[PDB]
Design a protein around this nucleic acid. Sequence first.
RNA 1: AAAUUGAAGAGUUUGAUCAUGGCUCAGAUUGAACGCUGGCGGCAGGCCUAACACAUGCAAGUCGAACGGUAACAGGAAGAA
Length: 155
Amino acid sequence: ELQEKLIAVNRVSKTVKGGRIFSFTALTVVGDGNGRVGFGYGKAREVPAAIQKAMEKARRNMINVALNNGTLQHPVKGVHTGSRVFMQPASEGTGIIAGGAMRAVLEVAGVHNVLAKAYGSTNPINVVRATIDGLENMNSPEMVAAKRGKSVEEI
RNA sequence: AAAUUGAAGAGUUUGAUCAUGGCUCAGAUUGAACGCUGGCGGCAGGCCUAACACAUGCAAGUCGAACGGUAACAGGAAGAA
Ligand SMILES: [Mg+2]
C-alpha cells in the first residue's frame, strides 16, 4: 500500500593486495503517501541485493510530517553537510517543482504542491538528508498552539 | 467579482568518497547569417557594416476671391469676310 522508489545507484571500490574490490550502493526513499517518509542506504556486490538492503533500512527509521493539504505548512529550509535545501508550499495544482532526489522524497511523502530548490552540493545522499531534516523541523498550528499556549485563533 | 497562483537539474578532478572549485549541457530569445529542403495564406519585419561615394526619376507647393498683365488653350465679336 505504501510507495517505495530508488534514488540512485553508485559503484564504489576498495582496493586490496589482489586489486580492486567493486561494490554497489543504493539510496532509496519509502513513504506511505501521507507524510510518513523514510530513507534507506545499503551496500552489496549486486544491484538487487543492494537495493533490497536499502528497502528494509528505509522501513525502519520512519518519520512523521504534519501536512496541511498535500503541501507544506510553511516555507522550510533544510541544511546538511554540503547541501542547502529551500522548500516552500505552493498553490493547488502547481505540482512538484524540485530536483531529482528531492522530488522522489517529496512525492513518496505525500506533498503534491511544492516549490523546492537545491543550493550547495547536489550529492543525492546529502540532499535526501537535508530534505528529511526540513520535513522534521516544519511544525503544525495545533502543536504551535499548545507550544505557545494561545489556542488556534492564529489561523 | 479579475488583474504575476511563483524557484528542477546533469556531466567532468579520485582506486573509491566528501568538499571546494572552474569548464560544459538541458531553456528562452534574435533586425539574425550559413548549410540541406521548400505548398499556401494572414499579420508583422527587412543595411546591425562605410555619418562611405553617388548616375537617374520623384520627395513643397499653393492662391486670379491681393496686383499688373496675356506668353498658351478654348469661348466671344468689329471687318476686306
Ligand atoms: Mg546605418
